[PDB]
Structure 1
């Protein structure tokens, strides 16, 4: 941590310059020599300050670790409202989560943000005050004094005390056959229903270590980690983008139609070339794109759907179609509310599917199948909070969902949710 130390000392130097004792906002960016890679995650997990948020874009070129909440926001709308009051810092990012219910978020304007774009990094310090910048400069000084040296990530422990499913196997069929009853009757066709698996461990589970474990195995995935406090965290490694906005340029995608992966290149690629020719999944995928274009059309100019591709991940492969377009207004609250929850995580039609989930699910999804990422005026990117876990002390809660459709069948969809959960379960068991 000679890079960090040096950066911290440049920052303390800046904070010792005259700062005006008037309301305002300052952004201090210190260049971060990236002669080696920096284990931003290990650094974050060494700190006793909360909240912490860690995020890496799925391609591996963009990474951030942010610490300490100058201000918290309970929705993305309230976040964007704050940013619009400061248009002179167009690149000022707010970081965190949106819940499965998108009117609810946990987002922060961080004290400190280390951010790498591929080859370059910046340690950014911000000051903000309704009253005195000089005052908050004092806080920043104290917050720096608070930071400790990078310690080795702690270990994962593998001793299990219990294993609960919500719903269990019988409750799953109880619910599945209810859902097909309901499909039988009305105009609902697809409903995505979830399971929670609670893993109870004899020791408290270190969430950053779990995250570090996931990053090694779960390639080509967004990695996201929020430490709300010392006892509670939510994290995941999702292959799915909700949206990316650069100015008004928007990218989203219809990621639906699942097979299992196999480690041999040929058998996985036969399992995939199959997926691309299966009329049916291609139909299911196409109903997802239609729904996305529908949801988008009144707020965008031309929508371009790209050719299908198979996305090979660790335990599981997906059919995806990307959809690019331009937004009429550079607005993140529109992207959020138009795109979440996805047709891939609620089902179809939108209202009816959400209403079934609301009516009937035996546990709250909370942050599962919301989104994670950041927004600034200039750009934003959120992933869907899939392949994720909620960590509370000694309990780890894994989430995975399946799209019930008519012929479904309990046990097959259950097996599918096992495979989706696998990408995380295998790090712990």
Structure 2
């Protein structure tokens, strides 16, 4: 990175004299040796420029860091319009978030992108201008000059100042009770209802160190972290894919239905068997397959829903049914608007569930249960923003949700959302 800063500089001096004073984009790819292990997260955390986005594939074999926004997008829709004016760079990637409401996003064209696939990495610098590439070359130089060498990343040393649930247990029970009562009206089939837990600390929270702690313990999860700026962040470790797209081949999953994990393998496996056989959870999952299959009918070709599998995580396990289809169009706005929010996350029918949530949830989910990842012309991948946290100075808001369906027992659902909140909370309160 010392060497690559140097190589980037050397490159930039030359370009800033040669490149034309015309609008456009250059993409500069430099191989990034992983001869020596490089901790991208703790590197990113060293930097003083914003915004910053961290993302790791759930399989752990794809990892990215982006630093600085050439452009900011308020929706995936806006980002795709931009990509489509640049068909010549089909692998140009925009990175970041969709909020719970999929029509609002915070996505970036990264100034600097470190991306790893496997045991191999690339540093990409991009130059973009509306007026002059020559111009943006000099901004690029100043950006580089901003770079700071890697410092070690401290573990969290946090003193809890304040705690509050929205809703609390008492309020949760009446809510779940209300929700089941409403489902018993025969029109609403399912609603997913969540709790925000505001945690205040004696000091500001290092979101990057929170992210690292989660990557260390929350295995088999996608990790996403956006630093909006130095005081504000959204991150999490989610087991769930919204979609992945390679040209036209589309992958999604119905992931819904939960039991506790146990550290002991047999017990975990037996608990998973209980889940597979459980009517209530079966139905909780089947309602997602129904929603997803319907939502995708008009815009896709032959659909394959696989049999349910149990997916095992640090504190929780889930039923999961992969889904494969082909899009009619290679279009990420069709993917996001058809899919998000699925009945795993909002409910069914979509309208009645969205309305119930708008009416009775004592907080706005904002980034919670949206989506995180990247799109480019050729491929994209987003996860669902579950198992996630919004950090505001010294407050961490934790989110957890439970799908409500006929037969939901409030006390069991409280226990569910606690097990979900725990994957992140236990990192903050040792």
Instruction: Name the CA distance, whole Å, in 2 between partners of 1:159 and 1:31.
Output: 42
- The 5 A counterparts of 1:63-212 are 63-212=63-212
CA contact (8 A) 1:3 1:33 kept: no
Distance 1:408 1:278, change over 3 A: closer
Q: TM-score, normalised by structure 2?
A: 0.97
TM-superposed CA distance for 1:184, in Å, is 2.4
Separation in structure 2 between the aligned mates of residue 260 and residue 11 of structure 1, nearest angstrom = 53
Q: Structure 1, residues 318-337: CA drift from partner, whole Å, max 9, x if none?
A: 11100001000000000000
Deviation at 1:360, TM superposition (A): 1.6
User: 1-side partners of 2:283 and 2:178: how far apart?
Assistant: 25
Q: TM-score, normalised by structure 1?
A: 0.97
Within 2, Cα distance between the matches of 1:7 and 1:272? 52
CA distance in structure 2 between the aligned counterparts of 1:273 and 1:8, rounded to whole angstroms = 54
Tell me, yes or no, if the aligned pair for 1:61 and 1:117 is still in contact at 8 Å.
yes
Q: Is the 8 A contact 1:10 1:30 kept in 2?
A: no
Structure 1: gaps spanning 5 or more residues: none
Offset of 1:226 from its aligned partner? 0.1
Q: CA deviation at 1:18?
A: 1.3
Is the 1:96–1:106 contact (alpha carbons within 8 Å) kept by the matching residues of 2? yes
Conserved in 2, the CA contact under 8 Å of 1:3 and 1:32?
A: no
> Matched residues in 1 for 2:386 and 2:7: separation?
35
- Secondary structure at the aligned position of 2:19 is classed as coil
Question: Which range is displaced more, 235-244 or 276-285?
Answer: 276-285
Question: Whole-Å Cα distance in 1 between the matches of residues 83 and 221 of structure 2?
Answer: 28
SS in 2 for 1:54: strand
Q: Matched residues in 1 for 2:335 and 2:100: separation?
A: 15
- Alpha-carbon distance in structure 2 between the residues aligned to 1:311 and 1:179: 27
When residues 6 and 310 of structure 1 are mapped into structure 2, their CA distance, relative to the original with a 3 A threshold, is farther
Structure 1, 3-12 or 150-159: larger mean CA deviation:
3-12
Tell me the alpha carbon deviations over residues 367-413 of structure 1, each in whole angstroms, 9 at most, x when there is no partner: 00000000000000000000000000000000000122233232221
Q: Give, in angstroms, the shift of residue 170 of structure 1.
A: 1.8
Secondary structure of 1:103's partner? Answer: coil
How far off is 1:179 after superposition?
1.7
Across the two proteins, how many residue pairs are aligned to each other? 429
Distance 1:362 1:33, change over 3 A: same
Residues 180-220 of structure 1, C-alpha deviations (whole Å, 9 max, x = no match): 23222241121110100111000100000000000000000
Identify unmatched segments of 5+ residues in structure 2.
none
Moved more, 285-294 or 196-205: 285-294
Contact 1:11 1:30 in 2 (8 A): no
* Gap change, CA 1:304 and 1:281, over 3 Å in 2: same
How many Å separate the matches in 2 of 1:86 and 1:183? 48
Q: Contact 2:21–2:132 (CA<8 Å) still a contact in 1?
A: yes
Flag the 1:359–1:9 CA change in 2: closer, same or farther, 3 A. same
Q: Distance in 1 between matches of 2:33 and 2:231?
A: 33
Query: Which consecutive segments of 4 or more residues in structure 1 shift more than 4 A?
Result: 1-7
Separation in 1 of the partners of 2:296 and 2:23? Answer: 39
Mapped to 2, the partners of 1:277 and 1:412 lie a distance apart of: 17
Answer whether contact 2:284 2:405 (CA < 8 A) is retained.
Answer: no
* RMSD of aligned Cα (Å): 1.4
169-178 or 129-138: bigger deviation:
169-178
Cα distance, 1:13 vs. partner? 5.8
1:248-287 deviation per Cα after TM superposition (whole angstroms, max 9, x unaligned): 0000000111000001111111111222233442333222
Cα deviation per residue 1:340-364 (whole Å; 9 max; x = unaligned)?
Answer: 0011111222111111111221100
Answer whether contact 1:113 1:124 (CA < 8 A) is retained: yes
* Gap change, CA 1:195 and 1:65, over 3 Å in 2: same
**CA distance in structure 2 between the aligned counterparts of 1:37 and 1:11, rounded to whole angstroms:** 25
- Cα drift, residue 308 of structure 1: 1.5
Q: Is the 8 A contact 1:7 1:32 kept in 2?
A: no
Task: Give the match's secondary structure for 2:158.
Answer: coil
- Cα deviation, 1:210-253, whole Å, max 9, x if unaligned, reads 00000000000000000000000000000000000000000000
Distance 1:14 1:251, change over 3 A: farther
- Distance (Å, rounded) in 2 between the aligned partners of 1:184 and 1:279: 17
Shift, 1:130, TM fit: 0.9
